[PDB]
């Protein structure tokens, strides 16, 4: 009840915080991935949706 | 009983061969394998039993030409997205293409 601790010296500390801000931007060609070079698939793909 | 497109084929249909063209985007029918691609000479090598070479996606990336027996790299014909940079139609109808 009658005792306290008071700091008699100081230390300056530098600490690193790393935060992600951005992610890789990607574009996907639907026709190329699903149907490759096949024209017939592309025509079928149009019907799908 | 026959197996399809996994080995060199000694039995073929009546289709007539055409002279190969390199460095151009072309439709190809190499021993029944059909694709559209640019065909280039390959600095790589193949074993005798290995007629066809596939990539990670399981799509052929190299083929051994029938007759000539020289391996040809298959590269997809150039493709890219098109984006139109446009000032508002009210301002102008002129457009830029990326």
From Swiss-Prot, chain B:
Q: How does it assemble?
A: Binds to host ACE2. RBD also interacts with the N-linked glycan on 'Asn-90' of ACE2. Cleavage of S generates a polybasic C-terminal sequence on S1 that binds to host Neuropilin-1 (NRP1) and Neuropilin-2 (NRP2) receptors. Interacts with host integrin alpha-5/beta-1 (ITGA5:ITGB1) and with ACE2 in complex with integrin alpha-5/beta-1 (ITGA5:ITGB1). May interact via cytoplasmic c-terminus with M protein. May interact (via N-terminus) with host bilirubin and biliverdin, thereby preventing antibody binding to the SARS-CoV-2 spike NTD via an allosteric mechanism.
Q: Which domain of life is it from?
A: Viruses
Region labeled Disordered — which residues? Answer: 6-28
The UniProt function text for this chain reads: Attaches the virion to the cell membrane by interacting with host receptor, initiating the infection. The major receptor is host ACE2. When S2/S2' has been cleaved, binding to the receptor triggers direct fusion at the cell membrane. When S2/S2' has not been cleaved, binding to the receptor results in internalization of the virus by endocytosis using host TFRC and GRM2 and leading to fusion of the virion membrane with the host endosomal membrane. Alternatively, may use NRP1/NRP2 and integrin as entry receptors.
Q: Please name every pair of cysteines joined by a disulfide bond in this record.
A: 25-77
Which organism was this protein described from? Severe acute respiratory syndrome coronavirus 2
Q: Which residues are glycosylated?
A: 90
Effect on the protein upon substituting residue 57 to D: In strain: Alpha/B.1.1.7
Q: What is this protein called?
A: Spike protein S1
């Amino acid at each position: 009840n009658n005792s306290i601790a008071i700091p008699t010296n100081f230390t300056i500390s530098v600490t690193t915080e790393i935060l992600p801000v951005s992610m890789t931007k990607t574009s996907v060609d639907c026709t190329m991935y699903i149907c490759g070079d096949s024209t017939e698939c592309s025509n079928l793909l149009l019907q799908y949706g | 009983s026959f197996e399809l497109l996994h080995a060199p084929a000694t039995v073929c249909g009546p289709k007539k061969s055409t002279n190969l063209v390199k460095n151009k985007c072309v439709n190809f029918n190499f021993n029944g394998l059909k694709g559209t691609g640019v065909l280039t000479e390959s600095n790589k090598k193949f074993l005798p039993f290995q007629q066809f070479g596939r990539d990670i996606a399981d799509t052929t990336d190299a083929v051994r030409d029938p007759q000539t027996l020289e391996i040809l790299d298959i590269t997809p014909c150039s493709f890219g997205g098109v984006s139109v940079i446009t000032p508002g139609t009210n301002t102008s109808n002129q457009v830029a293409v990326l």
